[PDB]
Ligand binder design. Sequence first.
Ligand SMILES: [Mg+2]
Ligand SMILES: [Mg+2]
Ligand SMILES: [Mg+2]
Ligand SMILES: [Mg+2]
Ligand SMILES: [Mg+2]
Ligand SMILES: [Mg+2]
Ligand SMILES: [Mg+2]
Ligand SMILES: [Mg+2]
Ligand SMILES: [Mg+2]
Ligand SMILES: [Mg+2]
Ligand SMILES: [Mg+2]
Ligand SMILES: [Mg+2]
Ligand SMILES: [Mg+2]
Ligand SMILES: [Mg+2]
Ligand SMILES: [Mg+2]
Ligand SMILES: [Mg+2]
Ligand SMILES: [Mg+2]
Ligand SMILES: [Mg+2]
Ligand SMILES: [Mg+2]
Ligand SMILES: [Mg+2]
Ligand SMILES: [Mg+2]
Ligand SMILES: [Mg+2]
Ligand SMILES: [Mg+2]
Ligand SMILES: [Mg+2]
Ligand SMILES: [Mg+2]
Ligand SMILES: [Mg+2]
Ligand SMILES: [Mg+2]
Ligand SMILES: [Mg+2]
Ligand SMILES: [Mg+2]
Ligand SMILES: [Mg+2]
Ligand SMILES: [Mg+2]
Ligand SMILES: [Mg+2]
Ligand SMILES: [Mg+2]
Ligand SMILES: [Mg+2]
Ligand SMILES: [Mg+2]
Ligand SMILES: [Mg+2]
Ligand SMILES: [Mg+2]
Ligand SMILES: [Mg+2]
Ligand SMILES: [Mg+2]
Ligand SMILES: [Mg+2]
Ligand SMILES: [Mg+2]
Ligand SMILES: [Mg+2]
Ligand SMILES: [Zn+2]
Ligand SMILES: [Zn+2]
Lengths: 98, 103, 67, 55, 114
Amino acid sequence: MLMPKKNRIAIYELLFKEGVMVAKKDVHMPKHPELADKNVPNLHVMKAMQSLKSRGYVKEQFAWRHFYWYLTNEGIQYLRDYLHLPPEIVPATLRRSR
Amino acid sequence: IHRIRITLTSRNVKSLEKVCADLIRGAKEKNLKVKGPVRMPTKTLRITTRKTPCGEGSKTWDRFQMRIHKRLIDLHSPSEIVKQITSISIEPGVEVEVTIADA
Amino acid sequence: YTTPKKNKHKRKKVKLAVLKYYKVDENGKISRLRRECPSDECGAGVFMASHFDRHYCGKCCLTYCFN
Amino acid sequence: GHQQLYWSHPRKFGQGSRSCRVCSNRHGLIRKYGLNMCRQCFRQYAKDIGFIKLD
Amino acid sequence: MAVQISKKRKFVADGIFKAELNEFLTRELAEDGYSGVEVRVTPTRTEIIILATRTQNVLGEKGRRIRELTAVVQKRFGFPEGSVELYAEKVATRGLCAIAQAESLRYKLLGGLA
RNA sequence: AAGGGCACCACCAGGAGUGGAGCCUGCGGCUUAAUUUGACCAACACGGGAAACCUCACCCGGCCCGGACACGGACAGGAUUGACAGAUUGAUAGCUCUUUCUCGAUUCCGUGGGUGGUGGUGCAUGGCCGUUCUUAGUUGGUGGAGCGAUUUGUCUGGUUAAUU
RNA sequence: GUGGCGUUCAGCCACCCGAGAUUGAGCAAUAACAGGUCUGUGAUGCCCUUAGAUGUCCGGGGCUGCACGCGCGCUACACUGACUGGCUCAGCGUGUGCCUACCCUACGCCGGCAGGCGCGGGUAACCCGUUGAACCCCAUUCGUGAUGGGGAUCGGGGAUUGCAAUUAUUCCCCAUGAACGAGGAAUUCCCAGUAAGUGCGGGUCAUAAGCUUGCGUUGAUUAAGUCCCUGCCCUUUGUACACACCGCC
Ligand SMILES: [Mg+2]
Ligand SMILES: [Mg+2]
Ligand SMILES: [Mg+2]
Ligand SMILES: [Mg+2]
Ligand SMILES: [Mg+2]
Ligand SMILES: [Mg+2]
Ligand SMILES: [Mg+2]
Ligand SMILES: [Mg+2]
Ligand SMILES: [Mg+2]
Ligand SMILES: [Mg+2]
Ligand SMILES: [Mg+2]
Ligand SMILES: [Mg+2]
Ligand SMILES: [Mg+2]
Ligand SMILES: [Mg+2]
Ligand SMILES: [Mg+2]
Ligand SMILES: [Mg+2]
Ligand SMILES: [Mg+2]
Ligand SMILES: [Mg+2]
Ligand SMILES: [Mg+2]
Ligand SMILES: [Mg+2]
Ligand SMILES: [Mg+2]
Ligand SMILES: [Mg+2]
Ligand SMILES: [Mg+2]
Ligand SMILES: [Mg+2]
Ligand SMILES: [Mg+2]
Ligand SMILES: [Mg+2]
Ligand SMILES: [Mg+2]
Ligand SMILES: [Mg+2]
Ligand SMILES: [Mg+2]
Ligand SMILES: [Mg+2]
Ligand SMILES: [Mg+2]
Ligand SMILES: [Mg+2]
Ligand SMILES: [Mg+2]
Ligand SMILES: [Mg+2]
Ligand SMILES: [Mg+2]
Ligand SMILES: [Mg+2]
Ligand SMILES: [Mg+2]
Ligand SMILES: [Mg+2]
Ligand SMILES: [Mg+2]
Ligand SMILES: [Mg+2]
Ligand SMILES: [Mg+2]
Ligand SMILES: [Mg+2]
Ligand SMILES: [Zn+2]
Ligand SMILES: [Zn+2]
């Protein structure tokens, strides 16, 4: 996957700040609907977390035409080493409420 | 004191006749002038399907339908005391939508 | 299984070794060789081409027909 | 790629730009009332949407 | 306030909302004797209860798997942030609803039993 | 073969027809680079199949990787990504070819191994539907009859649209 | 309820009073089938193919080509009608769409017509809409002539949808005026608001119904039986059948 570096970190840092992210299964979409700011299309985000599933860093599920993803405990420690974050920052799924 | 119109939409009548009667005596107990439940004509939605996944068969169609019941209540109340009349009966099949008075 | 041409072999980049756009003289002399681009994205940044006639910036694709 | 002719044919009007919301198929589609499903995937979710075969 | 929609189109888009949610959470809480939803839509926080049998798994590691199943709903279906919440109930008489026992027979056959 | 009963997808009594003509449309056949294909009472205005493109499989050409991940090379002395012009092309596919610029570790090259598929087999299957079959039909427990397969209950008769 | 027949049982027939003395459908057992669908599916097993790909995209073509055979239909063969003008009544129902661009349309003006340009209303018992539907009805022309029946074929022109209309998208106009005089052997539906005539919605739909699914509208002939034909259900009986009479031999 060609996928420039600015186009990659902006997917992972939203895949880190929430433990999940949801993309639609169509490769012909100009922008990702939630991201929509760094000019990232739906084809890069579908091929980001195909690399993470093959490395076990994420878990997927596919309802009708939407991929959903979930950080595993291996993926949390990897994103704290690739995004270069201090070893106390957690995703929102670990603690927001009680 | 306003002239407000509550609209009640549902898909089953026995779950709507309980909610709509709750709003009537709920405002007859709180001494308001309530125009009664006005019943709109229902809306049946009649998708008809071939029933077969392939094209082979004896051409047996499949008539699905869904009636939509809509009843409306017109009140004579200010904007405050209707809120505890509105928020005491959800009954999830009923979508209580309260409009505004002046319009 | 027709085989009219058998191959349409893909482009290979000619892989030039070093950078070497500048020069050096009298123990220190700044001297460009290729033209710079006047665009805002690469002003005094990347260089323009030097073809048989023209100059051409590879980033913003504008070229000037050197007649 | 490339970008100018990868998906350049206009997927406006026509059944090449209408897909089932469940199974992404382009034949036998029901677009009435904003269903936008196929005619077979409707019959799985006919009761879950809330249609009743009364007659 | 953004755009009005017809009553014949509103009830279909609401009934096909829960038809997708029931199918998705059949996939997730597949092994938890799932048995359906009950979606309470208000013009406020819309709670969606889950009727799974083994509530020890839908509530994750200190509530992990129910705080990342609300975050997929409001990011897909268009709900605003901090609005929707999922619950986790327990059905009584687990061997009396079929949507829990067909999956229960499923993992007997997937485990290798005759 | 005999005795009962039943149904306008059976007839009688009839009504409108169809079979004839023109066109519409679906199949076989022929033809074609292709005329994609399924189905032969229970196939043939059926696949909700009224296809200009898309659908679209099929035919003739041209890009693209949307080949995860692992391993070994290659490599900041730049792995590689784009592209104006001429030519080239159906084409404003930098698709190749000249020409040099640009990109910056994401790729590339091999060995594995995915992945995709309106590809095959409905005689490997699920599901769903049609039909046998729109008629009234089907089964256990205990007891009786039998060596047994099985049978009585589930019936001579009357009655009913109906083991009513 | 009343009368009649019946073992006076289950019931049936007639009759009164009544809106009605059988309104239509929906669901639908056991046991089966090598019935159809892998081209509905991120339902799927094995197999095949995977970069000169059976992946996917783009451009063009094909699915619609025609000595012929067959199936469902539409329009007809006219006077119980076509034509023109006037008159006058419906019922189902849809309508601006997450992606998604594509909504039903009143009224005013321009054009012969299809249509165009302006201004609105309607997310709808609110606006289109009192849905001024067709057949029918009333009056005129026609006059038994392949005729003013029938409108196939075909040329020229004008618009609309669209990225694009040629192998004609549809529509309008003026011309062209073909068989067809009620249908051989066969054969298909149907018994009451039914058959049939007659239009209007919905589905498909950017453009669009000779299709289908619904709706009203005008509204009968015949029959209240039978097992003769085609089959079905139960019982007795015959069998050399069990792949079960398309059997076996
Ligand atoms: Mg017959
Ligand atoms: Mg007869
Ligand atoms: Mg006829
Ligand atoms: Mg005929
Ligand atoms: Mg013929
Ligand atoms: Mg004929
Ligand atoms: Mg063909
Ligand atoms: Mg086959
Ligand atoms: Mg039959
Ligand atoms: Mg095509
Ligand atoms: Mg060039
Ligand atoms: Mg290239
Ligand atoms: Mg393909
Ligand atoms: Mg497939
Ligand atoms: Mg089969
Ligand atoms: Mg089967
Ligand atoms: Mg049966
Ligand atoms: Mg016994
Ligand atoms: Mg017996
Ligand atoms: Mg018997
Ligand atoms: Mg008897
Ligand atoms: Mg078979
Ligand atoms: Mg299937
Ligand atoms: Mg397969
Ligand atoms: Mg389908
Ligand atoms: Mg094509
Ligand atoms: Mg065809
Ligand atoms: Mg047919
Ligand atoms: Mg005429
Ligand atoms: Mg009316
Ligand atoms: Mg004539
Ligand atoms: Mg064309
Ligand atoms: Mg067409
Ligand atoms: Mg004319
Ligand atoms: Mg239409
Ligand atoms: Mg059709
Ligand atoms: Mg009879
Ligand atoms: Mg007989
Ligand atoms: Mg038989
Ligand atoms: Mg004998
Ligand atoms: Mg015998
Ligand atoms: Mg012999
Ligand atoms: Zn520049
Ligand atoms: Zn579908």
